[PDB]
Design a protein around this ligand. Sequence first.
Ligand code: ZN
Ligand code: ZN
Length: 61
Amino acid sequence: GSMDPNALYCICRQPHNNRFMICCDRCEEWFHGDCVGISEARGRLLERNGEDYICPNCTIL
Ligand SMILES: [Zn+2]
Ligand SMILES: [Zn+2]
């Protein structure tokens, strides 16, 4: 549910207190723009338009 500071979600399993991160509605988790490929400018755009982003892990799973 609510993302925590000392939690893990991304495939690499790292804290969100490092680099940019994105929220996936598919699995309802968090990921890294670098790991998924999304750019800081791209992820920020989907947040403004309100487009439910889907990590590359779910799209192929
Ligand atoms: Zn990662
Ligand atoms: Zn996902």
